[PDB]
């Protein structure tokens, strides 16, 4: 099936998922000079104090840390959003080199990686229903640059050995996602989609202006993961990001 290889990468996705060439595809380049400042843009409200992480899984294209979304334990609201969005999981996209890895770009600049904290609109009852709605998801995008180590990420980095291959999972309780947030919550926002098949156009993207920094050693661990399952030919999990897509008839709004 789909992947990030030469014969099934982003350039092929359109054959099984024609929406790949839709009107609001993600990711996109963020032209800082073209993005319009919106004063009516409310401040983001991130309430992760009651977050309940369950576990971590290698699904073959990334690793997800899942949370209990059966109650409003960790929600996202405010900003361009109307309603409450529960955190269901987070994952990253990264490269083989520090000069690449992020999905969104800032004035064409690529970051070493990109974190996605996924939230679904509770008014839709479950994530499955939400992804079928234009305003079903709220994804918080945070860029990662190589530099100083991020203490709040080390717990994730140390468990990766337990989920090296596709299909593996491990208990990952008591993880506090607030440790992955930059100091500032300034952001850019625009209507887009999932960056991996089925590429549903159900996402309100909120990309933070300020990046978080991680050490070269921390990102190196990410690069030692495997796309393949155990017992199969080793395929290093790297460059699991989709290239910038045409903005088309969309305008990116800034909160600053
Ligand atoms: O854009 B992201 O990388 O970041 C946030 C996010 C969330 C979910 C997916 N993926 C799905 O929701 N997949 C799916 C599978 C089967 C049926 C319906 C949906 C992809 C992304
Ligand atoms: Zn993602």
Author numbering: 4 to 125, 127 to 260
What sentences appear in the manuscript?
Carbonic anhydrases (CAs) are metalloenzymes that catalyse the reversible hydration of carbon dioxide to bicarbonate and proton. All human (h) CAs belong to the α-class, with 12 catalytically active isoforms so far identified. For this reason, hCAs have been recognised as targets for the design of inhibitors or activators useful for biomedical applications. Here, we report a structural analysis of benzoxaboroles containing urea/thiourea groups, showing that these molecules are very versatile since they can bind the enzyme assuming different binding conformations and coordination geometries of the catalytic zinc ion.
Analysis of the electron density maps since initial stages of the crystallographic refinement revealed that, as previously reported, all benzoxaborole derivatives bind to the catalytic metal ion in their tetrahedral anionic form. Electron density maps were well defined for the whole inhibitor molecule in the case of hCA II/thiourea adducts, whereas a greater conformational variability was observed for the phenyl substituent of urea derivatives. The conformations of the two inhibitors in the catalytic cavity are very similar with few differences related to the lengths of the phenyl-urea tails. Indeed, even if compounds 2a and 2b differ from 3a and 3b only for one atom (an oxygen atom instead of a sulphur one), their arrangement in the enzyme active site is completely different. One of the main differences is related to the geometry of the urea/thiourea moiety, which is trans-trans in the case of 2a and 2b and trans-cis in 3a and 3b. Thus, the different binding geometries assumed by urea and thiourea derivatives within the hCA II active site are induced exclusively by specific interactions with the enzyme residues. Based on the inhibition data reported in Table 1, showing that ureido-benzoxaboroles have greater affinity for hCA II with respect to thiourea derivatives, it can be supposed that the binding conformation observed for compounds 2a and 2b is energetically more favoured with respect to that adopted by compounds 3a and 3b.
